[PDB]
RNA sequence: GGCACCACCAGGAGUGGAGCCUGCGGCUUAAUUUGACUCAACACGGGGAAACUCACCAGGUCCAGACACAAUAAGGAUUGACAGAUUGAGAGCUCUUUCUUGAUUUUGUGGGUGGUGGUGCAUGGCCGUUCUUAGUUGGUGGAGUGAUUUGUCUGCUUAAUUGCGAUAACGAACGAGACCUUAACCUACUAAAUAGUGCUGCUAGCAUUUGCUGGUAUAGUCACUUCUUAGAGGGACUAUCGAUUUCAAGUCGAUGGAAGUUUGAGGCAAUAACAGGUCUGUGAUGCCCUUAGACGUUCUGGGCCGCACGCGCGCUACACUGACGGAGCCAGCGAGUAUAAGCCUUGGCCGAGAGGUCUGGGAAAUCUUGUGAAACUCCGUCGUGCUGGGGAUAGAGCAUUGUAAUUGUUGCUCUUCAACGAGGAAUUCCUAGUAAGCGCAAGUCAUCAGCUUGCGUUGAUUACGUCCCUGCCCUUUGUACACACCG
């Protein structure tokens, strides 16, 4: 009903947080990356970014139709008040969420870790990432647990720029002997950034010398 | 029910889109000869929550300090009600919500 | 202390080797010049780079400097 | 991958996995009666 | 679980025609606000259906997300003795958008 | 060799000595659930537990045991039940009692499922710690057969592997720094009836000089943005000038300045690691245990508070730089609701108080709210006295919250008025709006803040130095260690 300004913006955020996890659990197998809630008059546009937009929009769009119905019945929304669109992620290699979900689907198929880990190192860089580092922790046949880091290229660690040019995704992998924890850190190239800064804070680009012309003593060029 | 003194209240978490919508409405209220009052910068509200870092209760007593800035702006327009509402759809933005009160 | 770092020390001496004739011994004039010569991401690094370039310019007139 | 082998293989077999997927994925993108009525027809 | 045949019925004509059902996880709730029966009945009635491969169940933030399988439409086709006109509503081929 | 108020020097406030609050051990217990034990366990698990929470104890219910079978089963597989007994109970729990419902369902098999049950020494994630110390790495070149090494260093300097410089190295990367948030400046822009002001209408009091204090003002359909708010910018870069220095990095003084300690303060924070802590945050988890007389869940009552004792974080105080009694009277950070399940609550009226009642405002720069807070200041009483310091312990009474206050939730009134007369050995924190007082708000929260997280009022003494103690880092060195001295 009547809800305060402080309590309304938080509710929109809380709604987003709960809605986002719902897609992660339901659309985990389709490389779910993220969701964008575009509020508009007379409609609630929701844009989901996934590696595979066929599993959501399958068999005459039955799943996406049967999936928007699960949201009208839980948030007491009018059947016409919400519309869900499925959009393909443009650069699948630059999304750590897609890369972490892809790694889990390989580890659960029994593929070796080394072959699986290098499959995301090269896929991230091939998409144009400035750097990438993958950490996989857990237990594998051995009673003792271990973690292994797989770095590549250039990575920044401290300060604000990690919030601007780095996206991260952690998932738990359910194995027959325990839980495997994977961390996929991908740093995008700042030159391709279209909303924030387009370079690192300490990058200084000096222009070139425009000099080395020939000076003539003192004429006047009229027009 | 014609020309009225009409208030549009703008609230959002991020200021860039808030000022774009605010300036775009002001821009459209300039070429259209509509007298306007605003935008009025309301004192921003800092919603702060301070939790413990430890999920357990072991270690040094370290705390997080999260923040959620809420910026509120109100703009007063002197125009008929049909004109002001269509201005809102011209300057519709996902982040900023709009409420209109007479 | 006020020890300048390497991101400001090396970037300032590249300016002298490249734009010495247009530089000067005044910080205010140097500060405006480096905003059109270099792409500096932050204003604070602008007034630092120019503040050390001015010191080097003030030092070049007294004799030869190392690194330029 | 605790050996000099299977880790060589991790790299190579791993990289051919991506090279096959960048080209495949870059190709994937370049070429881009009701029911309630039956509950009311009891007249 | 002991559900009256009549109350179980309303649970079946809600899981068909809007073939998805959402139920908050509280067992003592008097009314699930969309099936005029006990909320616990809805959870346990559909726990059997997902137990016999007729609905997928998803759980997130203390909420149940029930969706009807294509195999489950056939089950309600015969057991409910309903006309063979299928396609509840989420299967009505409303088609997506591009 | 070097750095450091989690080290010291000069000092300040102390703690340890008293009473009490609270946590830990112990003792006790029907149970007094449990984790953590140097820093980095002990006002910590946001853990301020009447019920719930709850995991403990003494008892009582339910299946919320899906599903394939097999058995039983309409001549009824089973579920609910008045009355009496039973029970703590108006639990059909069970027992006499015959009624009701109708294949949902009862028994066995498998299979489940649920566990604040065990294992944090099987794990994920998170967090703490080494350590926010300043450290780490590769390309080419040099040395070595190699693992490796140099680069990554004598010296000076810095908060800093940060810089100068020396240089078989040269040129770089992460970390540092940059970055981000916040506080301090802008009479220079942009506006503001949810901010303020001068004028102006209308209007009050005091001396009449035209002055001085106000109220009113959402139509005065005024003027302005200095104070208030916040967006776009500007502004500090050690700027200029003196000293020292390898005349280098720098450092110390002045002048200007809002700001010259990284301008003050924080957020983030590298390469690896710990059997560090949590499965008592998770519908995060592998395995083990249990799964109908449950270790699931629920109901009732008790316990987590229990008291010969040892220890830690603190609060009141030991008086006169003070207690009371009147009077003066100034902040900032914040929070706030609807057919609820009841929010912040002014203003009026009762009441010594605590508190009660009637209206109204506020989903909020609008109202609570200028939160008229406390220390503080003035004037009085007291007069070195276990005194009017101090307010435990206890008796009697009055209200609030809550189903429920007994083992007093808390508040108020009268009475009792205890140790304590500045604290041994030891030991903690701290360098400027800082320490110390002093309160206020938010979190927990129906009630309860001696607790934390912040905020502001008043506001210092003493260094601006060192390796003497202590801890850590680096270099050299020894090694029979490499699961790395817990060897
Ligand atoms: Mg950096
Ligand atoms: Mg930093
Ligand atoms: Mg001392
Ligand atoms: Mg004291
Ligand atoms: Mg506490
Ligand atoms: Mg209890
Ligand atoms: Mg109990
Ligand atoms: Mg107990
Ligand atoms: Mg239990
Ligand atoms: Mg551990
Ligand atoms: Mg661990
Ligand atoms: Mg080399
Ligand atoms: Mg070499
Ligand atoms: Mg370095
Ligand atoms: Mg760096
Ligand atoms: Mg007004
Ligand atoms: Mg007046
Ligand atoms: Mg700082
Ligand atoms: Mg241990
Ligand atoms: Mg558990
Ligand atoms: Mg659990
Ligand atoms: Mg919890
Ligand atoms: Mg039991
Ligand atoms: Mg306790
Ligand atoms: Mg007791
Ligand atoms: Mg403490
Ligand atoms: Mg007094
Ligand atoms: Mg106010
Ligand atoms: Mg006395
Ligand atoms: Mg007393
Ligand atoms: Mg001392
Ligand atoms: Mg000490
Ligand atoms: Mg209590
Ligand atoms: Mg409180
Ligand atoms: Mg050795």
UniProtKB/TrEMBL annotation, chain A:
Stated name of the protein: Small ribosomal subunit protein uS3
Q: Name one GO biological process term.
A: nonfunctional rRNA decay
Q: Which NCBIfam families match?
A: PRK04191.1, uS3_euk_arch
InterPro entries recorded: KH_dom-like_a/b (IPR015946), KH_dom_type_2 (IPR004044), KH_sf_prok-type (IPR009019), Ribosomal_S3_C_sf (IPR036419), Ribosomal_uS3 (IPR057258), Ribosomal_uS3_C (IPR001351), Ribosomal_uS3_euk/arc (IPR005703)
Q: What is the superkingdom listed in this entry's lineage? A: Eukaryota
Key words, A-Z: Ribonucleoprotein, Ribosomal protein, RNA-binding
What family does the entry list? Answer: Belongs to the universal ribosomal protein uS3 family.
Coiled-coil features, chain-numbered ranges: none
CC per GO annotation: cytosolic small ribosomal subunit; nucleus; preribosome, small subunit precursor
Checking PROSITE patterns in the record gives: KH_TYPE_2
Among its keywords, does the record have Cytoplasm?
A: no
State the species of origin.
Answer: Candida albicans (Yeast)
Q: Show the GO MF annotations.
A: DNA-(apurinic or apyrimidinic site) endonuclease activity; RNA binding; structural constituent of ribosome
PANTHER family, per this entry?
30S/40S RIBOSOMAL PROTEIN S3, SMALL RIBOSOMAL SUBUNIT PROTEIN US3
Q: Does the keyword Mitochondrion apply?
A: no
Top-level taxonomy: Eukaryota, Fungi, Dikarya, Ascomycota, Saccharomycotina
Outline the extent of the KH type-2 domain: 19-90
Automatic annotation (TrEMBL), chain B:
Keyword Transit peptide attached: no
A GO BP entry: maturation of SSU-rRNA from tricistronic rRNA transcript (SSU-rRNA, 5.8S rRNA, LSU-rRNA)
Tell me which positions the record assigns to the signal sequence: none
Instruction: Spell out the PROSITE patterns in the cross-references.
Output: RIBOSOMAL_S10
Keyword field: Ribonucleoprotein, Ribosomal protein
Database matches in SMART domains: Ribosomal_S10
Task: Output the Gene Ontology cellular-component terms.
Answer: cytosolic small ribosomal subunit
Q: Name one GO molecular function term.
A: structural constituent of ribosome
Annotated ranges, domain Small ribosomal subunit protein uS10:
7-101
Top-rank taxon of the source lineage equals: Eukaryota
Pfam families, per this entry? Ribosomal_S10
Q: Which family, according to UniProt?
A: Belongs to the universal ribosomal protein uS10 family.
**Record protein name field:** Small ribosomal subunit protein uS10
Tell me the organism.
Candida albicans
From TrEMBL, chain C:
Report the leader peptide range.
none
Family to which the UniProt record says this protein belongs: Belongs to the eukaryotic ribosomal protein eS17 family.
Query: What is the protein name for this chain?
Result: 40S ribosomal protein S17-B
Please report the organism this UniProt entry assigns to the protein: Candida albicans
The gene designation is RPS17B
Query: Covered range within the whole protein?
Result: 2 to 69 of 137
Automatic annotation (TrEMBL), chain E:
Q: Which GO terms describe its molecular function?
A: RNA binding; structural constituent of ribosome
Q: Where in the cell is it found?
A: Cytoplasm
Give the superkingdom in one word: Eukaryota
UniProt keyword list: Cytoplasm, Ribonucleoprotein, Ribosomal protein
Location, primary (coarse class):
cytoplasm
Parent-protein start and end of this portion: 1 to 98 of 118
What's the name of the protein? 40S ribosomal protein S10-A
Family per similarity comment: Belongs to the eukaryotic ribosomal protein eS10 family.
Record keyword Ribosomal protein present: yes
Q: Where is the Plectin/eS10 N-terminal domain?
A: 3-93
Q: Which GO terms describe its cellular component?
A: cytosolic small ribosomal subunit
């Amino acid at each position: 009903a009547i809800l305060s300004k402080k309590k309304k913006l938080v509710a929109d955020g809380v709604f987003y947080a709960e809605l986002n996890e719902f897609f992660t659990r339901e659309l985990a197998e389709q490389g779910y990356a993220g969701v964008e809630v575009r509020k508009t008059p007379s409609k609630l546009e929701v844009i989901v970014k996934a590696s595979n937009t066929q599993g959501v929009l399958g068999e005459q769009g039955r799943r996406i139709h049967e999936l928007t119905s699960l949201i009208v019945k839980r948030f007491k929304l009018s059947p016409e008040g919400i519309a869900i669109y499925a959009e393909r992620v443009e650069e699948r290699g630059l999304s750590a969420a897609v890369q972490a979900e892809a790694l889990k689907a390989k580890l659960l198929s029994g593929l070796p870790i080394r072959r699986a880990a290098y499959g995301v190192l090269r896929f991230a860089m091939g998409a144009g990432a400035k750097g990438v580092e993958v950490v996989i922790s857990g237990k594998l046949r051995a009673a003792r647990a271990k973690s292994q880091k797989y770095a590549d290229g250039f990575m920044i660690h401290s300060g604000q720029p990690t919030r601007d040019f780095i996206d991260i995704a952690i998932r738990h992998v359910l194995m027959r002997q325990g839980v495997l924890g994977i961390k996929v850190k991908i740093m995008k190239d700042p030159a391709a950034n279209r909303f924030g800064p387009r370079a690192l804070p300490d990058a200084v680009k000096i222009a070139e010398a425009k000099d080395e012309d020939e000076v003539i003593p003192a004429p006047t060029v009229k027009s | 029910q014609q020309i009225h003194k009409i208030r549009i209240t703008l609230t959002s978490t991020k200021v860039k889109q808030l000022e774009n919508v605010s300036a775009n409405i002001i821009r459209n209220a300039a070429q259209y000869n509509i007298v306007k009052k605003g935008p009025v910068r309301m004192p921003t509200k800092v919603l702060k929550i301070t939790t413990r870092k430890t999920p357990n209760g072991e270690g040094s007593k370290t705390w997080d300090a999260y923040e959620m800035r809420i910026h509120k702006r109100v703009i007063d327009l002197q125009a008929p009600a049909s004109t002001v509402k269509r201005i809102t759809q011209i300057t519709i933005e996902p982040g900023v919500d709009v409420e209109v009160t007479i | 202390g006020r020890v300048r770092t390497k991101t400001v020390k090396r970037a300032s001496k590249v300016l002298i080797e490249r734009f010495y004739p247009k530089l000067t011994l005044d910080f205010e004039t140097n500060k405006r010049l480096t905003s059109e010569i270099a792409v500096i991401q932050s204003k604070r690094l602008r007034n630092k780079i120019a503040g050390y370039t001015t010191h080097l310019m003030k030092r070049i007139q007294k004799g030869p400097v190392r690194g330029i | 991958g605790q050996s000099d082998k299977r880790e060589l293989e991790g790299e190579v077999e791993g990289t051919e996995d991506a090279e096959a997927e960048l080209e495949a994925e870059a190709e994937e993108n370049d070429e881009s009666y009701l029911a309630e009525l039956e509950l009311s027809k009891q007249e | 679980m002991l559900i009256p045949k009549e109350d179980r019925k309303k649970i079946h004509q809600y899981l068909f025609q809007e073939g998805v059902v959402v139920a908050k996880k509280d067992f003592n709730q008097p009314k699930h606000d969309e099936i005029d029966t006990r909320n616990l009945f809805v959870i346990k009635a559909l726990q059997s259906l997902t137990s016999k491969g007729y609905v997928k169940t998803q759980f997130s933030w203390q909420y149940y997300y029930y969706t009807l399988t294509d195999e489950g439409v056939e089950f309600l086709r015969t057991e409910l003795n309903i006309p063979e006109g299928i396609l509840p509503l989420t299967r009505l081929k409303n088609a997506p958008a591009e």
